[PDB]
Symmetry: D3
Subunit: 259 residues, 6 copies
């Protein structure tokens, strides 16, 4: 659709159209690797998307192709940190969809993993690099990967640091669907619109519920936090707000203790 520029950044591009935001890593001369400035700007853009009551879905992608003809989603750290960014993407009450063309490698692979969903172009290439280049992500990069592809495949991914095609990535369970390169944005927009027709409260509650299977008390904070928000929107929940407004004690005596 007719995207409009939402904010200006050095290392990324940021657009909105209706209920969809699009965040584009824009360092194709570095295979869309993030430097600290890029992490800061990504974090800032995702915060903005979080603040916007109109935005229900964020598409995350890399600018491409580069002038060498190759595509990259994100190739990781360029040789707030990315852990802050991982947490924001994971916990924000909007659905984030990674649209991966070409390389999603290293820190860039973990970025795709922590997005709710991933749509891959058929030229996409996935994998980790840490043990080969001198790093590791033993956080969401390991445990959460295992909750997606299972323990055997997740260990293989990290120990060997091989590259995996889009088809292999879908088969192992870490990519939701694969489409041609020229259909990638359209597919992302279609999936976004399907989500945008849903109940925003139901969606945010489900996202918290999925996090709660992984994130212990931090997941409980998100899930219970949503319960509190819902409570505020009930008749019983509003008795507190109005009892104070009229300067009287709150009275919950008329409310049932449901089974």
């Amino acid at each position: 659709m007719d995207w409009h520029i939402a904010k200006h950044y050095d290392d990324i591009l940021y657009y909105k159209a209706g209920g969809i935001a699009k965040i584009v890593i824009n360092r194709p001369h570095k295979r869309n690797a993030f430097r600290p400035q890029t992490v800061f700007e990504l974090y800032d853009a995702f915060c903005n998307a979080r603040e916007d009551n109109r935005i229900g879905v964020v598409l995350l992608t890399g600018a491409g192709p580069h002038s060498d003809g190759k595509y990259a989603f994100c190739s990781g750290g360029d040789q707030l940190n990315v852990l802050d960014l991982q947490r924001l993407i994971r916990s924000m009450p909007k659905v984030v969809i990674a649209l991966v063309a070409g390389y999603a490698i290293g820190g860039g692979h973990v970025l795709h993993l922590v997005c709710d969903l991933t749509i891959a172009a058929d030229n996409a290439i996935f994998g980790q690099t840490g043990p080969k280049v001198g790093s590791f992500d033993g956080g969401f990069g390991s445990s959460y990967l295992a909750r997606i592809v299972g323990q055997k495949k997740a260990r293989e991914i990290w120990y060997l640091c091989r590259q995996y095609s889009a088809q292999e990535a879908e088969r192992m369970g870490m990519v939701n669907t694969v489409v041609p390169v020229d259909r990638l944005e359209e597919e992302g927009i279609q999936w976004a619109k399907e989500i945008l027709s849903k109940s925003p409260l139901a969606i945010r509650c489900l996202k918290a519920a999925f996090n709660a299977d992984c994130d212990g008390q931090a997941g409980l904070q998100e899930l219970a936090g949503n319960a509190t928000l819902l409570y505020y929107m009930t008749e019983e929940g509003s008795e507190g707000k109005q009892a104070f407004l009229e300067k009287r004690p709150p009275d919950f005596s008329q409310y049932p203790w449901l089974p």
Copy 2:
């Protein structure tokens, strides 16, 4: 406070008054040990209390004293008690164990899984499993550790000693201690304080506490409460509203809040 009989049982007594239910193990000649019939009746009475929209708090105790002047809450084993443990733990009403005299063996785990415990100062706590030929490695172990910490929980089970009411409060498993003649009255006061609270807030908090212990089963409770709350919102109304005007639900107007 006028208790009135709610149901009749062989092994237990069951009363209600206002928003409080009282369940009384009534086998003082057996030190209030539970037989299979007793568990069934206890399960049935707790189900009734769960079903009654008027009841917010359940007081659980044992009849006493016996002819010899000494009390028992529940002395353990004479539908299984695991089912009963789960019902007490998960029902969206606050359960308060009122312990006079012995709370021992299966009877001690009974007090543990109640939300709160108020003890008479003559109360006696402890496990018997390893001594008599049994064990509770479920809530009797892990949940006990979430109350008194790992060192004390292991001591309780490995040695099978008896602990006074003051010791039980000191180690964190008893909320307060009063003379035996004030036990019921204390239970009533605490119940009344809970009964003036928001019922939805209380039930959500109970699920939240269970959720720190029971993994996905705990999530089922917490999330289940989120769904119930959602049904009571305008956005959650749109479902039924639509369900009733043969139109598609329409959530277009609703914000995506931060």
Copy 3:
């Protein structure tokens, strides 16, 4: 298999034959949606199967086809509620197999998920509906689903509310096998018979062990509870009851402290 009726209900059917029980959701005029009475009747039937010592396996299915030729397993929602039923199916020490012909949708899809196993007809259709119709299951419907199909696919299922074929369902890991519709019951019976020839104690312990990877202390309650039951059936564990009958303190002094 010559089924005999074990108990009469309004909304469901309940048969037994040897070690197999069959529970049939019987509201095909409403696509086998459950009303509260349906849930109550389902709960009672499962309790009965739980309490019958000869029953080792329960087959859960939906009556079909409807007059229009279309099949339904369960289309979801039309005191005890479905959460109580979910727990009973999940924790009862007998294997429960969902036999899914046609739609397993909404609450009906979560019902299939919490059954130990799912055998699907090739016409079966799977999916959630909550965010689209005004509900959600953030309990076993989310977390447990993630333990079956992984986090990426589980989020996709809930956020988009699409429909999935039996074959797509098996591929993602949530259906154990797919057979033609006229072979579904016979496949269920065959799987049941293979289980019925196994050690009942081994089977119940394993079911508890699987639940223990999900349900924290409640899972431990099942696993440890099974350990206690086994303990009672041992010589050392019989000494307690024996000593009590001989009116003497239990004596364990001869028993070794094994490594």
Copy 4:
């Protein structure tokens, strides 16, 4: 202490001295209840402290006493983007020790704030309790589960279901307050505790904090703990080969490093 003002806000005060930051909720006319701006400012101050390499310890407190002589640490949400859940997470996860110095009321949302701080020092006049079920709210997140990891399941449920108030001495006995001191010694005690921490190894301290969160926060806790391991790795000889190799334009070679037991 020679405090210097680090930044100006409307609802709070923010000071630094050596390796200590002090964040003071400053709405004593509202019993130090937070409104949205207060939460924004607290978040900003804690971010600043996290970013300052010199700061190892943050003391969190409320200005007092009010005109009527009553003290408040924080009385929760003001009944007159970022919410306190974001603030709870920042305090919990930032790799600096946060000590709540509680004079008077730490109530409602203000009670949960004290809980998520690493440590709590209470004045003799401190009062603790939740209010949600009474006023029409609840915190089923760190306010419940984390509270249970501090005082145990029995006392935690009591605190929430009855919404009573607890003295400093009671809070210490139940395990949620680290020590109790006279109110005119409260700041001194905080500074002293801060100083003992500031003489420790910063890496060891941050790894420990992550290790404690890891007992509670599942994979998010793993992210912090493993995140610290990655950071430590970067500071080892073997971890440096990656950087050296890139800067010498050559394949990283780990061939000579042992596989230790």
Copy 5:
């Protein structure tokens, strides 16, 4: 009582009497700090105790007093490392009781923590030292300590590295009881005798159940492992062995599916 030396070591002493073993760290000139050989020898002694069918309880203590009149249990660090030793003490199906006179400090403090129980002399002194001396134990030293004294107190212990008296330690929940130093061994023996009169199978199952609340799948391995052991001791269990004693398929057809 009349201890008998079980095996000779350089850095420790190892005794047995009846169902009790006693392991004594014996480097009082080093405040009973452990060097690598000490850890090796302790591991060997605990292994021997695990393998001895007559031994139900191990008392762990430090030799004292030193010639300057001061006592030490263990003052911390002076192949196998202490992490292996921590795991063995924690998982072995015998009850381990730390008997602490004087200093239990640094790695020595964690050693007391991972023992099932701790009895302290009134002269005992507890605390951590890592952040002060240049180390940390973020494993059982942190998380498990929090399962004993709560999160507030556990953090204080580690961040400040102060020393705590026996009374303070008991009050915070990490010491089970406090006795005068000249009653310390006697108290340990009495507790051991009380455990030794219990059912060994019940004790080992409970120990596994406690670990299972902390150690995820590793805890499940212990608890389920005990269930398997109990199963082998049942009639239904023995059918497997006996059906193999006769080379005829195992037949579990007569066994009920209990509720």
Copy 6:
């Protein structure tokens, strides 16, 4: 590969070459079932591999084929225990790869599961046997299996005790790749070599990180233990060691408190 004998055993063979160790179960006349002697020797060999600083990868396999032409990896217990062995394979900081030709059955199936990775020959056969023969593994055999193939497939594997081909095993997620039997050792060696060129510290940290998603505090012990090891190798961590030598208090004053 120029294998050299590392140690001599009755029931197994043990070789090293460069950074690779190879452990071969050598009872083909018993379809490579393990007796207690076999478990002991396997434990000892894996311990030796853990201790050898040159060894980064261990290949575990069964000798084959037997004289009848059929292959076995390990057929389970032969009609220190295997739980100790499971723990050692799972926690040791070297990558273990199961190379499965023919049957990996019963206890032998769980053995393949707990290895980091599995490469199967296309003649490989996988399955559990417990409920059929009179046993069960409700520890890593259940829960960890579920973390690999999902809850539905894992329950099917145990409840029915069927046999699965190599292709079926790969499809469900528990086998990493499948090759002809005459390529099995070469494929294992190739995977080993790719791991051996990686950073050993990164690899061991990742292995602990994966275990930490399963093993609660025991997993934290491994992951935090690696953090402590890394800390000792930093400048700041060295101050502790240097300060003790110079008879002085450690001085951490110059070190920053990083964000």
